[PDB]
Design a binder for this molecule. Structure first.
Ligand SMILES: [Fe+3]
Ligand SMILES: [Fe+3]
Ligand SMILES: [Fe+3]
Lengths: 343, 272, 272, 49, 272
């Protein structure tokens, strides 16, 4: 690459500039050894395979011997996946007239789970249908994210961050044994969902958790990073209805650094506000074998006339079943209030 | 005589009274087997009894909760069954001895959580005002938008002129439609909230996801909205300076920072 | 009929089946008092019974363990008594009702830990694949050495030509001696591992601390090594570029950074 | 192992690479040899331990 | 025979002995119903018995405490009732069997805490020397003052010439007054401590908040001070270099840094 900026810092009359030749070696599988680099450095020069490397040669500064720190923007995602990309038709999401080449979070999770350089799990252990459906839905919603790895933390932390960003659950299916992903969206039919009743497979419901409304916030601050410049930016989400009732102002700060656009951050912030101020009802029900096939994140209906609870849609939470011995299948569920608006 | 009765070794007749208040509506309950009249207020007797677990004051809001046990048919708790009321139900607890007209205030707080573990009982978790100090207090960001909820004490914008009173045309599971709002530009009501009278001087509020033509999208569904009841709808502010001044002409109170600086430091590397 | 039997109020005959598999060898056990034939597989009956504690799926790998209780003489668990097998024992749990030929898969995982609290019992802790996500994922360092285990998918080095098959001359507590390896230069086998067939198509692997002359040092002792069994020994790579290319001629795939830079920044203080 | 696994341990007190490798071999042997842990109950004969 | 008796299956006669020592004063107690003579020391029998909970050595000082249960009238524990003694009461635990003159040392430590849960019992928590390693170890600051307690091993100042022996004139709730100290300049004794003999070769020490004229202010009150007992009072060092040298002429050992530098870096912005 011919970089031409000899007078960037005012040239001789200033502090110099950037003039030279830049050579980039991305580290392909078949990448060869660059003759110039080995000749200049000498010695035993390997091919530097598997890692992106660059070789700059030219003017860096003038007048003063103190070179300045640099900042380089770099997109990625396709050179990953070793040699076999998975569902490449929906790998990337285009935003801002193509300026931002965001990646689908589902692809990130799939690479982390099956990536040979990260975990190296067999591709056969993943339920293809669920992941493909999730990727299709995310691409349709145009919900992309950008991330960088420098924390050197456990896979669990990064996966939890991704799930919280997208609002999805990843669990190992008890029946088939593969990893399944479920999105928390209002994309269900009321009829097809199973119903549970005192006479239809419900034993006892103990916890009610009426909750409260006078508490909870009225204003929410969302902080995000714009990938065009990498500068911190924030948006404000307000709850006028709750704000009017509140005697004094309350505010909380949530960071979604993975969000590359303000509109997407607002979309997720509206979901968070609705969840946190709608007053969810939490129930701890006891069920018989009829609730054997349920999995985390699966919504279903519950009815109990004696308790005065009409047909309600709830989403499964913690599961603790006892097939042998006590025969007690106890589930913890929450009211269904998860949805990601597109506007 | 209340203190004297407490010090008395043979006249101990404890009776605990609960008063749930929400603005102009009050609910009175007693733990005894007969109604008690106090300060011209009669406290109902709940079949099955109402009892608590004790009062803890250790300085830790998370640990100093107050628990109430009562049947599942309790009137005050029944409201939380479908949706939590918008306003908080203040609770005041009195202590008095049968035959005495004097009572002492013991606990003051508001409802924190309600659940129905059994069909024959209900557990209510009451929280004190000290728990409201766990949330952050920054409440300040140097961003472009207003960073202020329309109508707050900082915006200083009067929404009473913008109040619109209407009767909805049709109500669906998630959308409430009215022709009167159809005459406004798309997104005029976006960010606003709908308030209507539930009982007495108390109203329930619901925020609006989006406004488009004659259809209004209600966050969390339209359940609990009366199909013929009178509804008050207020607009919403996007937060942009152009939006703030063109619509509301509140630019002098604009709390946002549109074009003061985005990154420019005075200790950078190269100004140009 | 399995689902129908589960929904049935009078035909409930629960029976839990366990299948421990390690490659080509499978162990089948049942919790009933008689053997059960399923999918042409007969499950043995353990005198004393085999039972678990329940299945938990809460999303926390540390908390969602599966516990198995069985006598101390259980064949599959007996292997762990002296040394843990090199390979992980996959476990699959089925559920079926007596008299029905249909079963449903409930739990899938591998052995996590085994202990023998009493002579008459043994407790096995089974872990799911979700627990393998707690370890870090950095797996990258800018150091001089290769930073790659010889033979991994990154080195792309075929060890089959370097395989050496031999019968050990003498076996001691910590040292296994053979004259064939005496013909190689000192340290040729350092970093390699020894694999030999235990049963069927499964081999047990042991790393080598050091190689010197005709004597090989085995990490953790030589216990469990057959004195006359056939042993396969592979070499080991030190990781240095000179070592990588002179011995294996795999320099193009060398993942190390020998002399690119040790500290040199472009924002330091004085270049000279 | 089906897929690669790695962990990072810092021994900043070690001044030489050979010493660091010596201790790292010990750590590897400990963590991959499959230790057996026992919780025994003893009478007074184990008093002096 | 102690070890032989422990190994014996029929001669087990356990008896635990406790020895509380504070300098020249020793308290001996036994858990049996009769006094035991060992090493020319007789151990009293406490009506009601003395017993512990067990010895734990897990490497965690916070968890490896030793608990002693004894009546509320125990002589050694009675001292802590009003104020904790200045010196720590070392405790040594022996084990012996009735009829044998040989004993084995089991636990060594000092009193950590004492409480009286019931009038008929008292619980003593004993801590080992390992718990003293939880406090920081910095003990270094680049400040102007001395950063050394007068008389410590770092100041190297002999306080014996400055010792003053006097009989207090009047003792009040918080102030002890004496005319002899009235002849010294105000603040001469500020920072010093008062030590007097309690019993044997053990003294109790009290620090001084302030000295003004003939009146001395005692931190924490004057309770426990004998009204006619002989008292030894030492001065106190403010820590300033002028104070250190003018009064004590210990400037060469001054550990403070008065005027070396307050902020001046060699990598700042502008030297002028
Ligand atoms: Fe505004
Ligand atoms: Fe290599
Ligand atoms: Fe001094």
């Amino acid at each position: 690459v011919r970089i031409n900026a000899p007078e960037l810092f005012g040239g001789d009359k200033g502090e110099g500039g950037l003039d030279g030749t830049l050579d980039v070696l991305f580290g392909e599988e078949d990448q060869g050894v660059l003759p110039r680099l080995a000749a200049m450095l000498g010695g035993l020069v390997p091919a530097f395979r598997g890692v992106t490397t660059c070789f700059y040669s030219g003017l860096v500064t003038s007048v003063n011997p103190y070179p300045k720190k640099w900042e380089i923007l770099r997109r990625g995602g396709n050179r990953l996946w070793d040699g076999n990309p998975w569902y490449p038709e929906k790998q990337f999401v285009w935003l801002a007239d193509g300026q931002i080449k965001a990646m689908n979070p589902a692809h990130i999770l799939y690479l982390v789970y099956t990536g040979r350089d990260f975990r190296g799990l067999a591709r056969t252990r993943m339920d293809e249908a669920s992941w493909r459906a999730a990727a299709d839905t995310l691409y349709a919603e145009g919900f992309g994210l950008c991330f960088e790895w420098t924390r050197s933390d456990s896979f669990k932390n990064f996966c939890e961050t991704v799930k919280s960003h997208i609002g999805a659950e990843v669990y190992p299916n008890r029946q088939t044994g593969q990893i399944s992903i479920r999105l928390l969206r209002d994309d269900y039919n009321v009829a097809d969902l199973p119903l549970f009743d005192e006479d239809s497979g419900l034993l006892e419901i103990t916890q009610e958790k009426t909750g409260s409304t006078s508490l909870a916030p009225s204003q929410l601050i969302v902080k995000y990073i714009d990938q065009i410049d990498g500068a911190q930016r924030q948006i404000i989400v307000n709850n006028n209805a709750v704000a009017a009732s509140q005697g004094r102002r309350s505010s909380e700060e949530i960071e979604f650094l993975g969000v590359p656009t303000g509109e997407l951050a607002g979309r997720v912030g509206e979901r968070e506000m609705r969840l946190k101020t709608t007053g969810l009802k939490r129930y701890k029900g006891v069920f018989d074998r009829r609730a054997r096939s349920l999995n985390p994140g699966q919504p279903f209906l519950i009815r109990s006339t004696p308790r005065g609870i009409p047909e309600t849609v709830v989403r499964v939470g913690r599961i603790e079943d006892n097939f042998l011995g006590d025969g007690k299948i106890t589930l913890t569920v929450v009211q269904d209030q998860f949805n990601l608006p597109a506007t | 005589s209340f203190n004297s009765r407490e010090s008395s070794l043979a006249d101990g007749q404890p009776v605990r009274l609960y008063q749930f208040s929400r603005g102009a509506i009050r609910w009175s309950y007693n733990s005894s087997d007969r109604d008690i009249t106090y300060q011209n207020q009669i406290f109902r007797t709940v079949p099955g009894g109402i009892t608590d677990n004790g009062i803890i004051c250790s300085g830790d809001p998370q640990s100093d909760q107050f628990v109430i046990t009562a049947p599942a048919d309790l009137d005050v708790a029944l409201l939380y069954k479908t949706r939590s009321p918008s306003d908080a139900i203040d609770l005041v607890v009195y202590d008095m001895h049968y035959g005495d007209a004097e009572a002492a205030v013991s606990w003051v707080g508001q409802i924190g959580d309600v659940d129905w573990p059994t069909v024959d009982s209900c557990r209510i978790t009451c929280v004190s005002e000290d728990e409201l100090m766990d949330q952050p207090g920054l409440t300040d960001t140097y961003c472009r938008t207003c960073t202020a909820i329309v109508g707050d004490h900082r915006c200083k914008v009067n929404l009473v002129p913008y109040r619109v009173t209407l009767t909805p045309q049709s109500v669906s599971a998630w959308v409430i439609s009215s022709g009167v709002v159809a005459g406004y530009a798309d997104g005029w009501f976006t960010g606003g909230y709908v308030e209507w009278q539930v009982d007495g001087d108390n109203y329930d509020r619901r925020f609006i996801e989006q406004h488009a033509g004659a259809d209004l999208h209600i966050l969390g569904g339209t359940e609990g909205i009366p199909a013929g009841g009178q509804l008050r709808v207020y607009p919403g502010c996007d937060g942009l300076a152009q939006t703030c001044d063109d619509k509301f002409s509140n630019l002098p109170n604009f709390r946002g920072f549109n074009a003061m600086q985005g990154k420019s430091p005075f200790d950078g590397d190269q100004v140009w």
